[PDB]
Write a protein that binds this ligand. Structure first.
Ligand code: NA
Length: 129
């Protein structure tokens, strides 16, 4: 599913991301935009052989099981395919684990490079929430 901007903001707010670990909703919307272009079925193979999955491009090296990333962990205890659903529950619950891990949202390279330090509120402007 390809979410619209305000559609995803509202969904992310219902799933508990607004201000989660101090990150305002616009941070999460900005990250999703640049990770996946709001597409829950986005996948990207990394050169280390791991794969990123879903609207927040969560990586199989640490976070989910895909059966083809040797020596990896599955810290969110999910198949990676769960991160591709139209239902964002698995992606949100796993993102909550990631952002709690010590480096905050810096774990998302696209957030650090394209969202961090910007007026992320623009991402939720004009939305009903
Ligand atoms: Na894994």
């Amino acid at each position: 599913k390809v979410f619209g901007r305000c559609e995803l903001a509202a969904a992310m707010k219902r799933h508990g991301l607004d201000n989660y670990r101090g990150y305002s909703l616009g941070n999460w919307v900005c990250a999703a935009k640049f990770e996946s272009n709001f597409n829950t079925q986005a996948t990207n193979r990394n050169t280390d052989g791991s794969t990123d999955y879903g609207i927040l491009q969560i990586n199989s090296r640490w976070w989910c099981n895909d059966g083809r990333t040797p020596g990896s962990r599955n810290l969110c205890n999910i198949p990676c395919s769960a991160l591709l659903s139209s239902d964002i529950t698995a992606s949100v619950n796993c993102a909550k684990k990631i952002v709690s891990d010590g480096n905050g949202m810096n774990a998302w390279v696209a957030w650090r490079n394209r969202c961090k330090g910007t007026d992320v509120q623009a991402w939720i402007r004009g939305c009903r929430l």
